Amino acid sequence: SIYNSFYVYCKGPCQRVQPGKLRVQCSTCRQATLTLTQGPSCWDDVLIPNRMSGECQSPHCPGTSAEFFFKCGAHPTSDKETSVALHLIATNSRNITCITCTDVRSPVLVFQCNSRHVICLDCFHLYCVTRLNDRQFVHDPQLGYSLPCVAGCPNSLIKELHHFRILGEEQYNRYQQYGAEECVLQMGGVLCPRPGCGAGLLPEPDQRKVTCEGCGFAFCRECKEAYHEGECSVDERAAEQARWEAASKETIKKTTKPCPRCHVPVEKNGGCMHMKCPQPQCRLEWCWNCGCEWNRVCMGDHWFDV
Ligand SMILES: [Zn+2]
Ligand SMILES: [Zn+2]
Ligand SMILES: [Zn+2]
Ligand SMILES: [Zn+2]
Ligand SMILES: [Zn+2]
Ligand SMILES: [Zn+2]
Ligand SMILES: [Zn+2]
Ligand SMILES: [Zn+2]
């Protein structure tokens, strides 16, 4: 790829976040024969069922609805070996600094708070690991546990929980255990402190000696050491800058570009990368990013960008 807009979680063989390929088919016959009236321009166009329409080219098909899906892009995949799109992950083409480390990194994760706060994937990982350690995940009745924007913005819980799969197997399994453990702790219990154990334990609440009976560890529930007698031994400017829609400096890529064929300056007016030259006698169709005739590789890698 010259450029990727999209990231998926590849469940096998990669077992990690990868660049993804976008596909559309006819929702009626399920073949790749749907010519869209208008190309996708944002996540809602490709995630909301039946949102986009066109015409199915299959002879005896009346289908007019699009169905979009994604595949891992790191190796060959079959026609419909699909993967879940991690729609919060964006390529950082405008060099936005990260809300917590202030470095320019790519890809980044964009929270769905009003501010659309930006955090790099390393800090997102660190943020999850910290919150797990400190027991700071947030409960949602219709979701389970998740995290809001790091800046604490309202209405910003991650809803698509495959985004936590990017923590990789061990942190992801700590995340998965969180709720069971939390139930124990709300009830006044205690987790075994032995690394690799962590059983949830519900001893009589006035007992200082807790025996894990898992691993047999007898501990002091106060200091968490082996049982003994006697006494135990976001920056404010960062969060203004690290916002997806905040005004930015000019990059090497211009926001007004010449048509590849007729050289007349063209303005882009939404998220679709498929441009149609507005000049009557030109009408070249081209990729805004790659500056070449519109094609299926551009479709797959970056039909739209955020
Ligand atoms: Zn893969
Ligand atoms: Zn069809
Ligand atoms: Zn960072
Ligand atoms: Zn926020
Ligand atoms: Zn234990
Ligand atoms: Zn103690
Ligand atoms: Zn032109
Ligand atoms: Zn392109």
Numbering used by the authors: 141 to 353, 359 to 378, 393 to 465
From the study:
To gain insight into the RBR class of E3 ligase, we grew crystals of Parkin-R0RBR (residues 141–465) that includes RING 0 (R0) and the RBR domains. We solved two structures of Parkin to determine if there were any notable structural differences between the sequence of Parkin originally reported (containing P223) and the updated sequence (S223). Overall the two structures were extremely similar; however, the loop containing S223 was visible in Parkin-R0RBR but not in the P223 structure. The R0 domain (residues 141–216) is a previously unobserved domain fold (based on Dali), while R1 (residues 228–328) shows the classical cross-brace arrangement and Zn coordination of canonical RING domains. R2 contains the proposed catalytic cysteine (C431) that is near the hydrophobic interface with R0. In our structure, F463 is involved in critical hydrophobic interactions predicted to contribute to integrity of R0:R2 interface. As is common for DUBs711 in our structure C431 and H433 are not well aligned for catalysis and implies that a conformational rearrangement must occur for catalysis to take place. The R1:IBR domain group contains the putative E2-binding site, which appears to be obstructed by a portion of the IBR, that we have designated the ‘tether’.
The covalent attachment of ubiquitin to specific protein substrates is achieved through the action of E3 ubiquitin ligases. Parkin has been proposed to function as a RBR ligase such that it encompasses both of the major classes of E3 ligase in one protein. Our structural, biochemical and cellular data indicate that Parkin functions as a RING/HECT hybrid. Parkin likely binds E2 through a conserved structural motif on a canonical RING domain, and also functions through a HECT-like active site cysteine whose activity can be regulated through interaction between the R0 and R2 domains.
